[PDB]
Design a binder for this molecule. Structure first.
Ligand code: 149
Ligand code: MG
Ligand code: MG
Ligand code: MG
Ligand code: NA
Ligand code: NA
Ligand code: NA
Ligand code: NA
Ligand code: NA
Lengths: 1015, 211, 174
């Protein structure tokens, strides 16, 4: 009858015999244990080794499995995804559904995980009370049997499913059997852009409650105008038989100190003509001068809810952490405890490179620490309710959480086809309602979300209203259908730009500054997704932050996103590598579009992370004469763990330093007077750097943690001295094939056929492996490629514009190559034209001046045709013969930085090992650039000027030809790229041209100069 | 919702209709026990949504109703908003929970008096004249049930109509009700007689309260 | 399977295989007939004489009833309330529920009306198109079989439940 009913193709049936949702229970039988949050004897983990067998469909499951173990089955760890154990492929797809769109139907071939466990139950659990089993997460649907008998059915992969096992169990041995289906009608609401996996991927537990039990409880905190008084209100629901002797006590604790307590019998206020709830009571506790919860200072009290007799016998106790805080929208501003928030948020999926979508405490803690160490204060549960511990950790460490229903129907056509259909309202309603019922007591949750990318339908409006009616303590947001519909309290677009409108029909993405002031618009704007961090990205990030700070109602956003969704695969030798979409045989796939993280799957930072840290700083700085002005962007805390270190240096050489304690009130200002600095004699630019240092450890950071920094140019002394006049004069030697120049043990050779420096010698050793040549292209970045799908191609993307114009296949044609002897130098003059099919794209005009001191001065002047797409870079490249250990530079660093992503980099003298000058993006591209460089040192070589550069063992050609980073081989020598000008990287999104006009190489005429010598 | 022909006839003859979802949970304690429970939202939504889908093209229907005597629960709020979103062309009304809740566009009490307050706890029935001017109240008031016409009744009917005519925002109401709910029974001869509650051995019963 | 599920005691199942609701349809194949609101050949009333047997519970219904007319059963007019034919008592109660207040459960003693009708369907409807049946009002819940096979289930006493019969019907008697 179970195989006959086919409940997994019926959206009308989303569970069978499932218990009601409720907040985290442990059924403590001792109050002190509840208060301290110690383990509960009444809550057991069924995690560990289980029996598992795979089947191609549910009809292939033998009727024996219900009563007897299958010897074919293996023993696997639960929780797990069965794709992580090799049983079938994980599918990566973005928009297009991973099954045929035929709702409510799924494929007849529907992979099926048969799980089972043989486990003990103690006798004490069956004489008194109620034993339930809790599956925290099962993807995507399942039937359950206990000792051969059918218990029930559940859908929604991301919320706990609970069943009463009381009548099913026996003392001693019992057997659970779970048939998990990969696909169900639930799948139609689970089209998030991520790995599609399956199985019992979250905790399994057994919970014993008394027959007379606390079955639900809500905590509210409300405040007077200045937050100096609060009323904690607790509504408590019971199940079982009503008795006059029953009582509830809610007591509230600050550490070991009890601050408030209330006790009452059951029976609520009159509600309507038929009375009130005899099975509920509300307790109200006064709290004077409450310690308020925020992401800045996560103050928590403990609330213990005791169900007991009037005489004092405890029946059970539940408990939660309480954060006293108010969230409201007033006059178009989102306020926390009366202060306008600035959301430094990131979207975070649940992902681990080894365990797939199984989460554990350590990874969660690691994520939290990294976020807070990098100046994040908020996280969005993209796009489903998370593992229950996540909320607890956000409560305790202090992050703001957007809790989001597990609803995404992105692949529907149009996007609201299911969400506007009243037949899908039941399935949708349980995903919203059961989330609110579970998470409503976590202070860290400040906003509810109705899901993701499912257009805007009537069902959203209804469920919007349901939440407002049930929980008025939190605003509700939802982006679908244009980000400002009647189903959201917050204008919450994805990838809306700062200044540029994108006026798509029906769902335009207005410039965020313009959106706020549309006639009639009052709401605050907080981007649910912005600054797409796919590969070499986060260009233009500073621009968002400049707008966030200037516009009160622009209250920030959530970066997309936190972690690369790469999975570990093994090679022939058993070495690990990172795999993306289409690497598991899966198709259709969206390839590398799954990796948009600020961190790699193993939590190693991308360079972009430091740019987010710098822009998200909580201290702002201004310099006037000798005075630094520090402004706090903290809303609640003083700077009680902050000191300012300042340093003045001349071209990287320190001249002075000092330390000044920070004592800044929230939103306040401090003036710091610098002492007179010793104005030096020698040339160069003076730079002031300041850093905010946290002297003491916190729960989330080590001692000495740098939380903010800033740099300013001070006095510049321009060099006016003539270099030491040389006695030696270089000697020009000519042949039909070459111009050669000699000075002592140095030698330069210019090919008269190509017109490039083909070789240089120090003593007798050759310096080049490839001639020094103009370069106008880069190995394409993910933002240059502009496809969100492997199928979809775009004629407008930068790489496609460059390809179609002939930039990559453009051949250098020599126009001029003269040599001339001067009084103390040899002067080589060249001209070249790069042409593609009769069209002149670029002209390069150069002079090389080798003088008596051994320096070669190169002057370059490039013309770019106004009607060719603006080039990726204007520079030179070559392959040096030398492979050295270190790279030493005076310029912006230490990390990779680009013209539209360099605010975080500082000007100084930097010294890294060669390997650090390469960024291991999984999809290889142009990488490791450093800008604003005045001097570069590598082995015997030194280049001076004002340039950008990258240096590595990988050619721009190898980088653009290889699809994975583990397939790259170090070439012979070192490839050097020296650019005079380099295009912005962009990243406002990654599926359209995103590089702002001021970062495109559009001037038409370009000029840079370089001095190359041997130190 | 009535027999489909009823709407057609109201279209053609000309009567304003309040089309009402088939939801009444009068017997629950408290009256909103089911309507405030999200697990009952699906059942309730179908009774609202399938009514709108069937009847929305009838000119005679001018107001949608969320049902009757089911208290006020969050499911009412959800379904109120669903209708306002799907069909902006008609006000939505619902009396449960005190006749002036957030799930109604119209103050629609049953048996509220003209001049006399009945201040029940939680669900007071204010004088209709006073109700209109409660601080912050803007809505029109139309009684969903008034002048209970049981047996020898309709005393003071004129008092309603005097107030209906004097107060712009008092826009009338619906008498309870049209037809006696008596069934036909026979004695030993074959003579028909009007039977009410209790006359079919039915117990517990509320007797002549059907008429 | 229909006895094991007990869909009438689960508020999560309010229908099975029911078609979407919609405004009144007649499927005219002539525009002038539509305009004039004259009868449509494609819309047929099944009102009239049906076969009917009363039971005290769904467990007491014999399985033979699925494929064969029961001889005990009487011929009755439909539409009707079976209380108006004397099979059991009509109940009058104001506020207090006529069943024990214990959601979602109903009494095991649950009067069960078994309705059936043998009817001809013409062949034109079988070769092409979609043939559905509409029950405008069924108090309070019901299962439906066509020619022995199960079609679907419906609740809500006061709105029409509609079921696609295209795959269930045959040439001749049904
Ligand atoms: O707009 C979106 O594009 C992102 C691209 O990485 C990602 O798929 C998000 O889930 C989706 O909301
Ligand atoms: Mg289903
Ligand atoms: Mg999507
Ligand atoms: Mg049912
Ligand atoms: Na702002
Ligand atoms: Na992505
Ligand atoms: Na590549
Ligand atoms: Na009036
Ligand atoms: Na009555």
């Amino acid at each position: 009858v179970v195989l006959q009913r086919r409940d997994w193709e019926n959206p009308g049936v989303t569970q069978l015999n499932r218990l009601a949702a409720h907040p985290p229970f442990a059924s403590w039988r001792n109050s002190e244990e509840a208060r301290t949050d110690r383990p509960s004897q009444q809550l057991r983990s069924l995690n560990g080794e289980w029996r598992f067998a795979w089947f191609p469909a549910p009809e292939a499951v033998p009727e024996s499995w219900l009563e007897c173990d299958l010897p074919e089955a293996d023993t696997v760890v639960v929780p797990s995804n069965w794709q992580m154990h090799g049983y079938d492929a994980p599918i990566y797809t973005n928009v297009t559904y991973p099954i045929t769109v035929n709702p409510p139907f799924v494929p007849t071939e529907n992979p099926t995980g048969c799980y089972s466990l043989t486990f003990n139950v103690d006798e004490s659990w069956l004489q008194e009370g109620q034993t339930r089993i809790i599956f925290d997460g099962v993807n995507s649907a399942f039937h359950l049997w206990c000792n051969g008998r059918w218990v029930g059915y559940g859908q929604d992969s991301r919320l706990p499913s609970e069943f009463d096992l009381s009548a099913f169990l026996r003392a001693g041995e019992n057997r659970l059997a779970v048939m998990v289906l990969r696909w169900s009608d639930g799948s139609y609401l689970e089209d998030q852009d991520m790995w599609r996996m399956s199985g019992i991927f979250r905790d399994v537990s057994l919970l014993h409650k008394p027959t007379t039990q606390i079955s639900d409880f809500h905590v509210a905190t409300r405040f007077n105008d200045d937050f100096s008084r609060a009323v904690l209100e607790a509504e408590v629901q019971m199940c079982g038989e009503l008795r006059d002797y029953l009582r509830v006590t809610v007591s509230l604790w600050q550490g070991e100190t009890q601050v408030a307590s209330g006790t009452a019998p059951f029976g609520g206020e009159i509600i309507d003509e038929r009375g009130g709830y005899a099975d509920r009571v509300t307790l109200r506790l006064n709290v004077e001068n409450p310690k308020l919860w925020s992401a800045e200072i996560p103050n928590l009290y403990r609330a213990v809810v005791e169900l007991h007799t009037a005489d004092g016998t405890l029946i059970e106790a539940e408990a939660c952490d309480v954060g006293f805080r108010e969230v409201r929208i007033e006059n178009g501003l989102l306020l926390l405890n009366g202060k306008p928030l600035l959301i430094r948020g990131v979207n975070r999926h649940e992902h681990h490179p080894l365990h797939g979508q199984v989460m554990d405490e350590q990874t969660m803690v690691q994520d939290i620490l990294l976020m807070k160490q990098n100046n994040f204060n908020a996280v969005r549960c993209s796009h489903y309710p998370n593992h229950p511990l996540w909320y607890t950790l956000c409560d305790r460490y202090g992050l703001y959480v957007v809790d989001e229903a597990n609803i995404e129907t992105h692949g529907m056509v149009p996007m609201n086809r299911l969400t506007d259909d009243p037949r899908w309202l039941p399935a949708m309603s349980e995903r919203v309602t059961r989330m609110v019922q579970r998470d409503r007591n976590h202070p860290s949750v400040i906003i509810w979300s109705l899901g993701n990318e499912s257009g805007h339908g009537a069902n959203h409006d209804a469920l919007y209203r349901w939440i407002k009616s049930v929980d008025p303590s939190r605003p509700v947001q939802y982006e679908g259908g244009g980000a400002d519909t009647t189903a959201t309290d917050i204008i919450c677009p994805m990838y809306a730009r700062v200044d540029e409108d994108q006026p798509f029909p029906a769902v335009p993405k207005w410039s965020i500054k313009k959106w706020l002031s549309l006639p009639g618009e009052t709401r605050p704007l907080i981007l649910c997704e912005y600054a797409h961090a796919m590969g070499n990205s986060l260009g233009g990030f500073a621009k968002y932050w400049q707008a966030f700070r200037q516009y009160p109602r622009l209250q920030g956003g959530f970066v997309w996103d936190w972690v690369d969704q790469s999975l570990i695969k093994y090679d022939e030798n058993g070495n690990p590598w990172s795999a993306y979409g289409g690497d598991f045989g899966d198709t259709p796939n969206d390839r590398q579009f799954c990796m948009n993280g600020l961190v790699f799957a193993d939590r190693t930072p991308h360079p972009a992370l430091t740019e987010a840290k710098h822009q998200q700083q909580f201290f702002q700085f201004r310099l006037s004469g000798q005075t630094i002005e520090v402004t706090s962007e903290y809303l609640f805390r003083h700077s009680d763990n902050e000191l300012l270190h300042w340093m003045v240096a001349l071209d990287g050489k320190p001249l002075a330093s000092g330390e000044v304690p920070l004592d800044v009130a929230p939103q306040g200002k401090q003036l710091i007077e610098l002492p007179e600095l010793p104005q030096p004699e020698s040339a160069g630019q003076l730079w002031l750097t300041v850093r905010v240092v946290q002297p003491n450890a916190t729960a989330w950071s080590e001692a000495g943690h740098i939380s903010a920094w800033q740099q300013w140019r001070l006095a510049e002394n321009l060099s006016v001295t003539l270099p030491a006049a040389s006695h030696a004069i270089p000697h020009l030697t000519t042949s039909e094939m070459d111009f050669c120049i000699e000075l002592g043990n140095k030698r330069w050779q210019f090919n008269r056929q190509s017109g490039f420096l083909s070789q240089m010698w120090i003593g007798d050793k050759k310096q080049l492996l490839t001639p020094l040549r103009d370069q106008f292209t880069r190995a394409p970045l993910d933002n240059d490629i502009g496809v969100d799908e492997a199928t979809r191609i775009d004629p407008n993307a930068w790489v496609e514009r460059w390809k179609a114009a002939g930039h990559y296949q453009a051949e250098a044609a020599l126009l001029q190559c003269t040599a001339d002897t001067l009084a103390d130098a040899v002067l080589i003059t060249t001209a070249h034209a790069w042409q593609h099919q009769g069209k002149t794209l670029f002209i390069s005009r150069k002079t090389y001046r080798i003088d008596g001191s051994g320096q070669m001065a190169i002057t370059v002047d490039v013309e770019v045709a106004s009607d060719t797409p603006h080039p990726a870079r204007i520079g030179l490249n070559c392959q040096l013969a030398q492979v050295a250990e270190r790279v030493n530079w005076l310029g912006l660093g230490p990390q990779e930085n680009y013209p539209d992503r360099l605010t975080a980099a500082c000007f100084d003298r930097w010294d890294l090992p060669l390997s650090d000058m390469y960024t291991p993006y999984v999809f290889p591209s142009e990488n490791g650039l450093r800008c604003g460089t005045r001097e570069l040192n590598y082995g015997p070589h030194q280049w001076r000027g004002d340039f950008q550069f990258n240096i590595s063992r990988y050619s721009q050609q190898q980088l653009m030809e290889t699809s994975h980073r583990h397939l790259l081989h170090a070439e012979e020598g070192t490839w050097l790229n020296i650019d005079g000008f380099h295009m912005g990287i962009g990243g406002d999104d990654s599926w359209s041209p995103s590089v702002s006009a001021e970062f495109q190489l559009s001037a038409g005429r370009y000029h840079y100069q370089l001095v190359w010598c041997q130190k």
